[model samples]
Target: VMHYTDKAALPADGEAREVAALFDTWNAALATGNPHKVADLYAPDGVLLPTVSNEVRASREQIENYFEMFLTKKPKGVINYRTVRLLDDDSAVDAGVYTFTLTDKNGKKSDVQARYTFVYEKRDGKWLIINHHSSAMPEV
Candidate 1:
């Protein structure tokens, strides 16, 4: 082995739930359909790798722009699967699968099962998102 000194310090179920709850907060933000509200959830420099758009969003304004368009579809998301743990006490990662119910202006609806990964870092007592990658699943 090249190097194997430190092992990951896992989180307790309580903390795991606490950290995972971030997704809920993010979900609620989406419910409002206010791109700025969703954008505020991420760190100022947080990265948003969205599935719908073939772009890497790295700034608050950029993230807001993407959501501005996405919010038009009236998306509602529900988690299908999720795994949450910690790399360090202050660093947490959540990877999961979720489904989004999207309704069009005419009230037509569709479902999309997507894959998601979110990373957060606690700095100065507040958890800030570092990055988030969300993409549609290839197979259902």
Candidate 2:
């Protein structure tokens, strides 16, 4: 049990936990197999630097287009390591390494780990992702 001297302790802890849970929200959307649902998590003018594409998915349509094919691989991600930083009461950043278990058409599965970051802003009473970047792990 942790002793709390400052009330900010619990609130600060909750801040991180809240941002962390956004990942779970996103992963659940992936399970739905609907690209639009995943894309909807982002702000309409959001940006996605995807793991599979070099092109910048800078708009809602672009993001959905990338996910339309990538989601076909049936990817489910788990965060391996992460750090959450709150820039303000309504803005936060989560960056970390994550592993994705992906299934192919033949029922074959593969695991890929990547470095990723998610930047979110609370707008209109909603925390929408403004920028998301995922890159291949180098130096393997």
Candidate 3:
């Protein structure tokens, strides 16, 4: 039997575990310049609000379109994920910072950073991304 609850912890089934794997998969994909793989973590109608884009991807297709540019624009960078936990058996949220160390085609590198928050919800016993929001830290 399938049980549902709202508690932000790892789920109790193998399938849920697989969906949760997206957390690691996503970061790994980004580390390797695989935006297409990272984008797959989202739900079909998932939304992405990016700090750089200043526009929300209303659908996964739109998100993929955005990645076409984001992924290829620069070399892969270092992504440090602090903590990610499932809010419940069917819901989760992850927060962390991603630092894009961009290298120009000519080999000059610069740092760009952002703080991110992601919320995922289970749909029909399968987890799907519902919301993704990313913002850079204010100058201090």
Candidate 4:
């Protein structure tokens, strides 16, 4: 079942909190049904490859379209991720899974699960996602 929280909140960081915040930020954007805020999570010229579209967006405009559809939908999802600390302090890779509960305007419910990979770069102190790839995984 796809169960989504109406409000997004981040987990407290003991170890993985920073990475978890990304999920919180993303989810919150969706909860508020705001596309621009979701775009804020990416760096300029970031890349987003979504299995739902099979098209890779290499610019902020392209990424924004993804969120356009994202916020318009009533989707409830949970994201869990792990960050790989790299020798280069500015660059890192992460992989995670998310499950979303979706409801149509008529109030029909469904669930969608997916796995994701992201490349993040810490430029000028803050972190931004430079690359994101996501794919849906059907239940067995």
Candidate 1 Cα errors over 4 Å, as ranges: 1-13
lDDT of 4 by residue, 22-136 (tens): 6667767778777788888899978998857877888888888887886666766676434444436677666767677787778888777777777778889877998888888
CA lDDT of each prediction against the hidden true structure? 0.84, 0.87, 0.67, 0.71
20-109 per-residue lDDT for model 2 (tens digits): 888889999999999999998999989999998989999899999999999999999888777789999999999877888899999999
What ranges in model 3 sit over 4 Å off?
A: 1-21, 31-35, 75-85, 123-126
Query: What is the per-residue lDDT of model 3 for residues 1-140, given as tens digits with 9 covering 90 to 100?
Result: 22212223444466545554665566566666666676777888789997679778987678877777776656353445435666777887766666666666677877667677778888787666788887766762
TM-score of 2: 0.90
Q: How far in Å is the alpha carbon of 47 misplaced in model 2?
A: 0.4
Backbone atom clashes (below 3 Å) for every candidate: 0, 0, 6, 2
User: How much lDDT does candidate 1 score?
Assistant: 0.84
Where in model 2 is the C-alpha error above 4 Å? 1-13
lDDT of 1 by residue, 1-140 (tens): 12212222324368898788888788899999899999988899899999799989999999999999999988887777778879998999998777788998899999877888999999888888899999988754
User: What value of lDDT does candidate 2 attain over all alpha carbons?
Assistant: 0.87
TM for every model, in the order presented, reads 0.87, 0.90, 0.68, 0.78
Top model number, lDDT: 2
Model 1 vs truth, CA RMSD: 7.8
- Rank by TM-score, descending? 2, 1, 4, 3
